[PDB]
Design an enzyme around this catalytic site. Structure first.
Site, PDB file in Angstrom:
ATOM      1  N   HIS A  19       0.537  -0.783   0.050  1.00  0.00           N
ATOM      2  CA  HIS A  19      -0.131   0.075   0.275  1.00  0.00           C
ATOM      3  C   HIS A  19       0.909   1.455   0.368  1.00  0.00           C
ATOM      4  O   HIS A  19      -0.089   2.544   0.946  1.00  0.00           O
ATOM      5  CB  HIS A  19      -0.841   0.139   1.402  1.00  0.00           C
ATOM      6  CG  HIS A  19      -1.947  -1.101   0.830  1.00  0.00           C
ATOM      7  ND1 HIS A  19      -2.490  -1.409   2.274  1.00  0.00           N
ATOM      8  CD2 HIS A  19      -2.323  -2.155   0.144  1.00  0.00           C
ATOM      9  CE1 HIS A  19      -3.175  -2.940   2.226  1.00  0.00           C
ATOM     10  NE2 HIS A  19      -2.939  -2.646   0.519  1.00  0.00           N
ATOM     11  N   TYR A  47      17.367  -7.460  -8.214  1.00  0.00           N
ATOM     12  CA  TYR A  47      16.940  -8.548  -8.417  1.00  0.00           C
ATOM     13  C   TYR A  47      18.964  -9.444  -9.049  1.00  0.00           C
ATOM     14  O   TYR A  47      19.032 -10.512  -9.541  1.00  0.00           O
ATOM     15  CB  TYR A  47      16.247  -9.209 -10.290  1.00  0.00           C
ATOM     16  CG  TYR A  47      15.023  -9.081  -9.278  1.00  0.00           C
ATOM     17  CD1 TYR A  47      13.934 -10.739  -9.377  1.00  0.00           C
ATOM     18  CD2 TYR A  47      14.005  -7.755  -9.634  1.00  0.00           C
ATOM     19  CE1 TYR A  47      13.336 -10.698  -8.617  1.00  0.00           C
ATOM     20  CE2 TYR A  47      12.884  -8.558  -8.773  1.00  0.00           C
ATOM     21  CZ  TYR A  47      11.911  -9.910  -8.890  1.00  0.00           C
ATOM     22  OH  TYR A  47      10.943 -10.043  -8.082  1.00  0.00           O
ATOM     23  N   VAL A 125       9.791 -13.545  -0.400  1.00  0.00           N
ATOM     24  CA  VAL A 125       9.857 -11.473  -0.765  1.00  0.00           C
ATOM     25  C   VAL A 125       9.333 -12.038  -2.056  1.00  0.00           C
ATOM     26  O   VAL A 125       7.885 -11.084  -2.608  1.00  0.00           O
ATOM     27  CB  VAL A 125      10.939 -11.036  -0.391  1.00  0.00           C
ATOM     28  CG1 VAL A 125       9.843  -9.455   0.132  1.00  0.00           C
ATOM     29  CG2 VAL A 125       9.667 -11.085   1.488  1.00  0.00           C
ATOM     30  N   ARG A 126      10.214 -11.837  -2.505  1.00  0.00           N
ATOM     31  CA  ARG A 126      10.323 -11.524  -4.529  1.00  0.00           C
ATOM     32  C   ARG A 126       9.389 -13.246  -5.224  1.00  0.00           C
ATOM     33  O   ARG A 126       8.234 -12.000  -5.962  1.00  0.00           O
ATOM     34  CB  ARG A 126      11.808 -10.922  -4.423  1.00  0.00           C
ATOM     35  CG  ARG A 126      12.269  -9.667  -4.452  1.00  0.00           C
ATOM     36  CD  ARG A 126      11.589  -8.137  -4.044  1.00  0.00           C
ATOM     37  NE  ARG A 126      10.557  -9.078  -5.632  1.00  0.00           N
ATOM     38  CZ  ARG A 126       9.884  -7.467  -6.252  1.00  0.00           C
ATOM     39  NH1 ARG A 126       9.910  -6.790  -5.278  1.00  0.00           N
ATOM     40  NH2 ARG A 126       8.914  -7.954  -7.673  1.00  0.00           N
ATOM     41  N   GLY A 129       5.774 -13.509  -4.503  1.00  0.00           N
ATOM     42  CA  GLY A 129       5.529 -11.854  -4.917  1.00  0.00           C
ATOM     43  C   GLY A 129       4.734 -12.009  -6.157  1.00  0.00           C
ATOM     44  O   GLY A 129       3.941 -11.407  -6.355  1.00  0.00           O
ATOM     45  N   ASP A 130       6.045 -11.826  -6.712  1.00  0.00           N
ATOM     46  CA  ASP A 130       5.882 -12.453  -8.783  1.00  0.00           C
ATOM     47  C   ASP A 130       4.680 -13.074  -8.995  1.00  0.00           C
ATOM     48  O   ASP A 130       3.838 -13.220  -9.709  1.00  0.00           O
ATOM     49  CB  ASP A 130       7.432 -12.712  -8.738  1.00  0.00           C
ATOM     50  CG  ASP A 130       7.879 -11.527  -8.539  1.00  0.00           C
ATOM     51  OD1 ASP A 130       9.534 -12.060  -8.769  1.00  0.00           O
ATOM     52  OD2 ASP A 130       8.211 -10.208  -8.807  1.00  0.00           O
ATOM     53  N   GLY A 134       2.001 -11.418  -9.495  1.00  0.00           N
ATOM     54  CA  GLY A 134       2.260 -10.334 -11.283  1.00  0.00           C
ATOM     55  C   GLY A 134       1.811 -10.729 -12.483  1.00  0.00           C
ATOM     56  O   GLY A 134       1.491  -9.281 -12.973  1.00  0.00           O
TER      57      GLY A 134
END
Lengths: 209, 209
Positions: A19, A47, A125-126, A129-130, A134
């Protein structure tokens, strides 16, 4: 179960990152393809660091099945940026924002310490999430900013046939990792830190807009 | 089809744009030739941008039959301005209002990203408006303020023999434009944005900005 504990442990930092004003304005269509491109340039930097850390920890023999190389985003992202920018020379212009410098520094520390539990936190986390959000972000970039789907390779995982199944199996791999209490606590703390780094990445991106 | 969905999707923004105090005052005769000239100066700035984006998207091969070069207004408008202002002075005098800055920025971003769906949205809002609302405007500038029709070339489309047929055929082309769901969504989103940009241009004119 580690997957459930990760979700609960990181809930406050996660909500706050997601948010951020920048992401919120981006997803509502208030910004533009420029801001999306700036996001992806910063993402290419972290990345790149993340995947050096992943490479090290995988080579060490830690969490091998979780650290699926099919997840690698850095080269896919470079191709997206070539298309978004129209030339290959964004590479010389871009530099890490202050949050991204901090995030990359932590990822490099994790690489050099070959810190498996901390790496797993960042990976969750990455990449989860993707995998999870995504398609939503990709759909939004087409809807709001007319981004060529060919420049959204980042949001597409070639060779993952079915995302639902993959995500479920990813959580099970998390659940099946053998971790001492010390490692598990280290991982959990790091996952919050990783959400925080991402929040500050967005804050840098939205500054002065 | 699309033409109907487009009208329906843009209805609120369109109504707001059409009911600006500035345009209401101008069209019912409370203003004057000065205000009409300020409008047309700002219009020259955004048509110049719009027509660069149109040229780019047409060259790219998208919506070719819609992007009729006969619609081009910038050159005609410059001549109207020469007549309204009495010389070419306006060229070095005029400056974009804050609203027109944002509008021109969007048109330049559509041009740079060669965003065909977005361009069609902006093209509809301006040119289909000119072929309808603008016709009332031209009649009222002459009747209320005594503007010579020589300075209203903007509202005359020399290349267009029958406005009624032209508008009907335009909408049928819209209905036959091949678009992905995402492109269609983007076109609809941009069309609302285009009406809002125009509303804001009128607000700035009314504020003397």
């Amino acid at each position: 179960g580690l997957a459930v504990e990760l979700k609960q442990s990181t809930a406050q930092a996660h909500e706050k990152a997601e948010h951020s004003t920048f992401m919120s304005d981006l997803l509502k269509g208030r910004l533009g393809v420029a801001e999306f491109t700036r996001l992806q340039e910063q993402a290419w930097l972290f990345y790149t660091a993340l995947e050096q850390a992943v490479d090290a920890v995988r080579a060490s023999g830690f969490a091998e099945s979780l650290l699926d190389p099919a997840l690698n985003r850095a080269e896919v992202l470079a191709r997206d940026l070539d298309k978004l920018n129209g030339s290959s020379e964004w590479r010389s212009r871009i530099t890490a924002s202050p949050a991204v410098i901090d995030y990359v520094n932590r990822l490099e520390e994790i690489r050099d310490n070959v810190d498996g539990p901390a790496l797993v936190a960042h990976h969750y986390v990455r990449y989860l999430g993707d995998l999870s959000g995504g398609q939503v972000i990709a759909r939004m970039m087409q809807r709001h900013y007319g981004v060529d789907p060919e420049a959204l390779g980042f949001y597409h995982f070639e060779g993952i046939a079915k995302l639902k199944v993959y995500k479920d199996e990813y959580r099970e791999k998390l659940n099946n990792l053998e971790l001492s209490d010390e490692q598990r606590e280290h991982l959990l703390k790091e996952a919050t830190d990783a959400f925080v780094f991402n929040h500050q990445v967005f804050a840098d991106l939205g500054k002065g807009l």
